[PDB]
RNA sequence: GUCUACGGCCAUACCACCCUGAACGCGCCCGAUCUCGUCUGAUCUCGGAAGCUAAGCAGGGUCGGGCCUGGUUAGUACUUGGAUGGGAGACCGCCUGGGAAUACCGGGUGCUGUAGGCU
RNA sequence: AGACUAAUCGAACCAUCUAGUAGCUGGUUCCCUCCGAAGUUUCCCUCAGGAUAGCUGGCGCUCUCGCCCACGCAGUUUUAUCCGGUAAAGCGAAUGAUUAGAGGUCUUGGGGCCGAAACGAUCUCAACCUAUUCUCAAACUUUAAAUGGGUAAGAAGCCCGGCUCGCUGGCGUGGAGCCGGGGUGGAAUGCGAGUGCCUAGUGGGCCACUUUUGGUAAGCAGAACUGGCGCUGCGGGAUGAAC
RNA sequence: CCAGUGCUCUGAAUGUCAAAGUGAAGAAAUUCAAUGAAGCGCGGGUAAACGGCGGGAGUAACUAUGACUCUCUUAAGGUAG
RNA sequence: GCCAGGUGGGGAGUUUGACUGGGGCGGUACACCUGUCAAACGGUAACGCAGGUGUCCUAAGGCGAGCUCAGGGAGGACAGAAACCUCCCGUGGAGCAGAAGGGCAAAAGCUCGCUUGAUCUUGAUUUUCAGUACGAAUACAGACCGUGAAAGCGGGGCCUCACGAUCCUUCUGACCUUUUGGGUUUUAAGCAGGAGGUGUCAGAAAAGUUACCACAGGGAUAACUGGCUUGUGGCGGCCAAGCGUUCAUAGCGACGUCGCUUUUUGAUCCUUCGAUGUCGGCUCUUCCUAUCAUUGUGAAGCAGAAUUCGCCAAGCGUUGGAUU
RNA sequence: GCCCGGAUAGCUCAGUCGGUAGAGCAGGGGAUUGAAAAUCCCCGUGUCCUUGGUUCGAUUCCGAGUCCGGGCACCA
């Protein structure tokens, strides 16, 4: 029952069939894993963009 | 069967080099890490809290998260079939800036200023890098003196 | 004690006698200099040594029988006390025997196939010294006829190059007498301490 | 190991550090008429023999010494548990050691 | 030209041995009632100036040792790619590019930022 | 004697349940056109099998090129910039093996003689120290290549201006976020890219240049990198799976 | 040779021991205790029951071999033949 | 008759791990660490090598502050190879619980002073990875704190291992949910987080023999041949210290080294498991030469005699028996 | 060739419990006997097999060998 154990012979040729797809470009990076106190500032900063300013900034 | 554990090939990689066993030089902490920066990862044997892992030594990633005294990076690590975007949490000592963008951002500043002057006097600039062309038809000098003759050496053991 | 034909080509990484191997017995050789060990520098000007040619191993016992036959011809033909022969190849490379017939097939196969140690051998590059013999200037045919009786006893094939240097000091024999007497070089037993002129000035005042 | 009788640790009723008594966890007597005891006994009564597998192959020698903590400070009295790592020997409240002392067997 | 307080690079700035050190300053020093600490005011703390650069420290020197930097060592040692190239093998030559390391030799021997003091 | 019990015995015969079960052997019926692999990961009472990824096929969908510069992508270089400790090298640099002499004299282990006879002293044999010296290391290194690994090469950028914040705070300060305005051109090279569903087969591998571990060695056993035989004929090697 | 494993004899002298039965508490389900048949545990018997049967050292006036002396040790240490 | 407790291979039903240079006996390479092998990123195998682990710690955890280590020298009542004090030098040559590797100097080490951050809870990520989990770890975040003058530092042990699912049980938590027609209470069922285990360690409940054997199969896997390899066996070659009255070599030859052979064996598993009938003898044939005798020669420590050493050489010969 | 056990006095055994060296036997000097055997008073001795790590300390706990004595070398 003796066998062969581990070989990456023909694994270079399988991986590059479809190709090493590099993710590299997308915009507005996902916002999980963020420092929460920072996020406990920024959601407040967004909700007073709407409410706090019409007349000051638009004019 | 390779004892698939953590930090196992690191007799030489987290080893501080030579004559620089000692404290971390405290400009290591006073570097300003804003978001979006491109920073490189070199492990340090001295700060045993937040060393990354052995498979991220030397890779180049991107800062996404900043805390009190560490920094989160997004890093393009490779696995079996494909290459992944991973999030590491590294303390500051195992970080340094990458001068690839610094010479790049100086490459931007020159190209902006040449663009300023191209509108100024009306001369076409060619700030875009062309590769190193084949040499020009230069004109050597051999004034009076003759070329030194070279023949090979004899063999003596 | 297996034939040395098999343990001849260098194949495995060096596996020396140290903290972790420990089981290999003593080398065949113990000593390395045979003639006038106490010799001055100026007594034996020329040197003749055996340039290795192959990239092979030498068995440790090949060293022993060679310095015997090399000693035996010098004491016959230049007499006693008229030469100095140094074996410049220390055997550290330890090899392994996987002892079997222990005669029956009812013990074990090739299962535990690591070797317990048997003896040491010595490695050889191309262009490497084996035995240097420094002699009186008159022994020039004898140094050839001494080592030719050793060349029939090492494995493989490697030649004899009567060198250009002064004895066993590394310096050129053409410049040695020109320069030892004048200044700088100071003789020291078999070797010669080379002095620089970058030392403290009481090094220079201690001479003259 | 040696862990002291008294220990000041966070209680979960009145939101503070309070002192506690480390008392030893015991298994306690199990119950007949519990859920799995009734189901195993309804399964058992019959000409079928042993149905659920009993375990014979023990390998571990150590139990995690786990700790009741009773709040000493009155009217709160919220018992809770904790764990120490695996260990062979455990005394609770005696013979803390000396450094500057000869053994003298 | 220098010096203190705080420092970044962390030996070109350490180490040994020696020569000089105006004025501030750094120091040593005289002292223990308070403050504070040890077997002891030596250390630590505490209050002052009778003395002195001998020490620290600062400068310079040593055919100095280290360190740093560049040559020689050497297009060598190894090396990606290539061959119906050699050789029984060992291993080697060639085309193609990349190319070190020590003996050994020569040269350096702190540079500074912020505030503040001396001529 | 495990014999005999209707040519049947270490449990007869007959019929049913029964077309019992099987990861195991053998077979699996018309042509043509297109596309075309795997023996690897992890876990399993897993090792002659599956599960899962990988690999394969099919069916679509969302777009762009048809006209002094495109968009996007990559088993490639180029230009920058960090990372490594293998070859080689070194041990008069650490650690660790290690050969041989000369100088120097505190140190006891031994003798030659002064001998009541005394560290009162003569030449020492050995060790010690200094400066040399031969040779080495998969589980040692100061040094340190070739090949290599990551990232970067702009409009997602860059600048100016202004508001928000419950976080930060001497500072209208730190930093994110939001709003409006202004200039497309930022190495070479090649290409049409992007994305979702379902799913067969596979899960016994083998040989060769160089690099390699166990062996004395093997048409042996185990690998790394790449190509191939397998899956593939043809021309050469008389003939042959791989040259 | 009664150590072992077996069979067997006898004892409330004495540790264990399940139902039923009784007592105490609980509104009751239930919870607890006391009492304790056979068997086990404890004591004896048996090997024409299974079967079991040692190793060192010193030692005699040629040297030798060892009656003898010693020691560890077992349930017992292979006697007749 | 019925219930309970003993005995019960007399009778019944099942189980007899896996990896393995065939199996078995052995060993754990079955989970997990460290150095290497690994061919300078990461990854990378063998019953490849060296080693460890299933623990220990109320301080060896935490914070502050003080101090600096092994080792050597010169000194000093009894004191010496070793007591104690003192001075000097002392870059890690000591120490940090134990395997090693890294890391460490007004410190991660030593001593001391207060201490329980080894506590409460929701995510995110790193590791192994299928990009699932346990385990472990890092950054945070909301609490309650410790220590410190303070900045800070700490949610265990300086880091890389030191541990464990469902179902069941047990315990704690809310002045919690459901207890089935509505209620009151006991019991039970749940939600959340701690334990009691699966070491074949991603988790079966488990002994043996078959020569009386049976079926499914395998040359994926032995024993016979044949092949590759030739250690071992067998045969030769080179060098010359010696031996040989003198004489290295007529005849031998130590120490060394280079080969051949497939009649021993060993090692390997490529061919054969829908079979290739596997010891020895007898009978008979051919061939090999590494020649025992014969034909012709060469050499001797060859006088003749007997011998021995080589050469062209397989033409011809190499018997009769007791024992197994 | 693998798997298991041990070294202590002149012999045979302890204690191996990491802080004493013990038990018997023989030898040695007494006394008892005219002389021995035996009895009584007495003592004498351990390179704790070798070597190193573990500890404050090794005779003990581990590792390493020098050897002695086991149990195994099974299916074709
Ligand atoms: Mg497989
Ligand atoms: Mg029943
Ligand atoms: Mg004073
Ligand atoms: Mg006082
Ligand atoms: Mg002064
Ligand atoms: Mg003076
Ligand atoms: Mg100077
Ligand atoms: Mg110098
Ligand atoms: Mg029978
Ligand atoms: Mg019949
Ligand atoms: Mg039958
Ligand atoms: Mg059918
Ligand atoms: Mg039917
Ligand atoms: Mg059927
Ligand atoms: Mg096709
Ligand atoms: Mg499998
Ligand atoms: Mg099949
Ligand atoms: Mg497709
Ligand atoms: Mg390496
Ligand atoms: Mg090398
Ligand atoms: Mg599949
Ligand atoms: Mg193979
Ligand atoms: Mg196939
Ligand atoms: Mg193909
Ligand atoms: Mg082909
Ligand atoms: Mg053809
Ligand atoms: Mg051919
Ligand atoms: Mg062919
Ligand atoms: Mg009995
Ligand atoms: Mg009753
Ligand atoms: Mg006798
Ligand atoms: Mg008898
Ligand atoms: Mg039965
Ligand atoms: Mg099996
Ligand atoms: Mg690597
Ligand atoms: Mg690599
Ligand atoms: Mg150390
Ligand atoms: Mg250590
Ligand atoms: Mg401290
Ligand atoms: Mg918090
Ligand atoms: Mg009801
Ligand atoms: Mg498992
Ligand atoms: Mg059976
Ligand atoms: Mg096959
Ligand atoms: Mg042979
Ligand atoms: Mg075979
Ligand atoms: Mg086969
Ligand atoms: Mg095979
Ligand atoms: Mg033993
Ligand atoms: Mg004895
Ligand atoms: Zn409370």
Swiss-Prot record, chain A:
Residues 1-31 are annotated as: Disordered. The keyword Acetylation applies. The keyword Phosphoprotein applies. The modification N6-acetyllysine is found at residue 32. GO terms for molecular function: cadherin binding; heparin binding; RNA binding; structural constituent of ribosome. Keywords: Acetylation, Cytoplasm, Heparin-binding, Methylation, Phosphoprotein, Repeat, Ribonucleoprotein, Ribosomal protein. Its main location: cytoplasm. Belongs to the eukaryotic ribosomal protein eL29 family. Component of the large ribosomal subunit. Component of the large ribosomal subunit. The ribosome is a large ribonucleoprotein complex responsible for the synthesis of proteins in the cell. This is Large ribosomal subunit protein eL29. It comes from Homo sapiens (Human). The chain holds residues 2 to 60 of 159 of the full protein.
Curated annotation (Swiss-Prot), chain B:
Residues 111-122, 135-144 have a biased composition (Basic and acidic residues). The keyword Ribosomal protein applies. It is found in: Cytoplasm, Cytosol; Cytoplasm; Endoplasmic reticulum. Its main location: cytoplasm. GO terms for molecular function: RNA binding; structural constituent of ribosome. GO terms for cellular component: cytoplasm; cytosol; cytosolic large ribosomal subunit; cytosolic ribosome; endoplasmic reticulum; membrane; synapse. Belongs to the eukaryotic ribosomal protein eL21 family. This is Large ribosomal subunit protein eL21. The gene is RPL21.
UniProtKB/Swiss-Prot annotation, chain C:
Its main location: cytoplasm. There is a cross-link at residue 183 (Glycyl lysine isopeptide (Lys-Gly) (interchain with G-Cter in ubiquitin)). InterPro entries: Ribosomal_uL16, Ribosomal_uL16_CS_euk_arc, Ribosomal_uL16_dom, Ribosomal_uL16_euk_arch, Ribosomal_uL16_sf. The modification Citrulline is found at residue 30. PROSITE patterns: RIBOSOMAL_L10E. It is found in: Cytoplasm. The keyword Cytoplasm applies. GO terms for biological process: cytoplasmic translation; embryonic brain development; negative regulation of apoptotic process; negative regulation of transcription by RNA polymerase II; regulation of translation; translation. Citrullinated by PADI4. CDD domains: Ribosomal_L16_L10e. GO terms for cellular component: cytosol; cytosolic large ribosomal subunit; cytosolic ribosome; endoplasmic reticulum; membrane; nucleus; protein-containing complex. Keywords: Autism, Autism spectrum disorder, Citrullination, Cytoplasm, Developmental protein, Disease variant, Intellectual disability, Isopeptide bond, Ribonucleoprotein, Ribosomal protein, Ubl conjugation. Changing residue 62 to V: In MRXS35; increased the formation of actively translating ribosomes when expressed in a yeast heterologous system. There is a cross-link at residue 170 (Glycyl lysine isopeptide (Lys-Gly) (interchain with G-Cter in SUMO2)). Pfam families: Ribosomal_L16. GO terms for molecular function: RNA binding; structural constituent of ribosome; translation regulator activity. Component of the large ribosomal subunit. Plays a role in the formation of actively translating ribosomes. May play a role in the embryonic brain development. Belongs to the universal ribosomal protein uL16 family. This is Large ribosomal subunit protein uL16. The gene is RPL10.
Swiss-Prot record, chain D:
Keywords: Cytoplasm, Ribonucleoprotein, Ribosomal protein. Its main location: cytoplasm. Residues 33-52 are annotated as: Disordered. It is found in: Cytoplasm. Gene3D superfamilies: 3.10.450.80. GO terms for molecular function: RNA binding; structural constituent of ribosome. GO terms for cellular component: cytosol; cytosolic large ribosomal subunit; cytosolic ribosome; endoplasmic reticulum; plasma membrane; ribosome. Component of the large ribosomal subunit. The ribosome is a large ribonucleoprotein complex responsible for the synthesis of proteins in the cell. Component of the large ribosomal subunit. Belongs to the eukaryotic ribosomal protein eL42 family. PANTHER family: 60S RIBOSOMAL PROTEIN L36A/L44 (PTHR10369). This is Large ribosomal subunit protein eL42. It comes from Homo sapiens (Human).
């Amino acid at each position: 029952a003796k066998s062969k154990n581990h070989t990456t012979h023909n694994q270079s040729r399988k991986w590059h069939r479809n190709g090493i797809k590099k993710p590299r470009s997308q915009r507005y990076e996902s916002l999980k894993g963020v420092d929460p106190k920072f996020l406990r500032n920024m959601r407040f900063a967004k909700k007073h963009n709407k409410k706090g300013l019409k007349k000051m900034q638009a004019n | 069967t390779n004892t698939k554990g953590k930090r196992r090939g690191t007799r030489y990689m987290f080893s501080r080099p030579f004559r620089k066993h000692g404290v971390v030089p405290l400009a290591t902490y006073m570097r300003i890490y804003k978001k979006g920066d491109i920073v490189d990862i070199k492990g340090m044997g001295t700060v045993q809290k937040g060393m990354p892992h052995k498979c991220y030594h030397g890779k180049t990633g991107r800062v996404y998260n900043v805390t009190q005294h560490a920094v989160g990076i997004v890093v393009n690590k490779q696995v079996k079939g494909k290459i992944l975007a991973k999030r590491i949490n590294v303390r500051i000592e195992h970080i340094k800036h990458s001068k690839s963008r610094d010479s790049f951002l100086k490459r931007v500043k020159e190209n902006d200023q040449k663009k300023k002057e191209a509108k100024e006097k009306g001369t076409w600039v060619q700030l875009k890098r062309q590769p190193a062309p084949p040499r020009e038809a230069h004109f050597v000098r051999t004034n009076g003196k003759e070329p030194e003759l070279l023949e090979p050496i004899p063999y003596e053991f | 004690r297996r034939p040395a034909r098999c343990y001849r080509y260098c194949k495995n990484k060096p596996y020396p006698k140290s903290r972790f191997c420990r089981g290999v017995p003593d080398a065949k050789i113990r000593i390395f200099d045979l003639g006038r060990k106490k010799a001055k520098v100026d007594e034996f000007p020329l040197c003749g040594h055996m340039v290795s040619d192959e990239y092979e191993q030498l068995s440790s016992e090949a060293l022993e029988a060679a310095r015997i036959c090399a000693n035996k011809y010098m004491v016959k033909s230049c007499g006693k006390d008229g030469f100095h022969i140094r074996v410049r190849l220390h055997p550290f490379h330890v090899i392994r025997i996987n002892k079997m017939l222990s005669a029956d097939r009812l013990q074990t196969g090739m299962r535990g196939a690591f070797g317990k140690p048997q003896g040491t051998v010595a490695r050889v590059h191309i262009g490497q010294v084996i035995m240097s013999i420094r002699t009186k200037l008159q022994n020039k045919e004898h140094v050839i006829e001494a080592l030719r009786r050793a060349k029939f006893k090492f494995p493989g094939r490697q030649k004899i190059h009567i060198s250009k240097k002064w004895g066993f000091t590394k310096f050129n024999a053409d410049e040695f007498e020109d320069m030892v007497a004048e200044k700088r070089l100071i003789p020291d037993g078999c070797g010669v301490k080379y002095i620089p002129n970058r030392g403290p000035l009481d090094k220079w005042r201690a001479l003259h | 190991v040696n862990v002291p009788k008294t220990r000041r640790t966070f209680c979960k009723k009145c939101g503070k550090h309070q002192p506690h008594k480390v008392t030893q966890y015991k298994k306690g007597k199990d119950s007949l008429y519990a859920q799995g005891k009734r189901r195993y006994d309804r399964k058992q009564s019959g000409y079928g023999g042993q149905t659920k597998p009993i375990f014979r192959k023990k390998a571990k020698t150590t139990k995690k010494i786990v700790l009741r903590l009773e709040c000493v400070e009155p009217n709160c009295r919220s018992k809770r548990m904790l764990a120490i790592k695996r260990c062979k020997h455990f005394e609770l409240g005696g013979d803390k050691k000396r450094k500057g002392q000869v053994i003298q067997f």
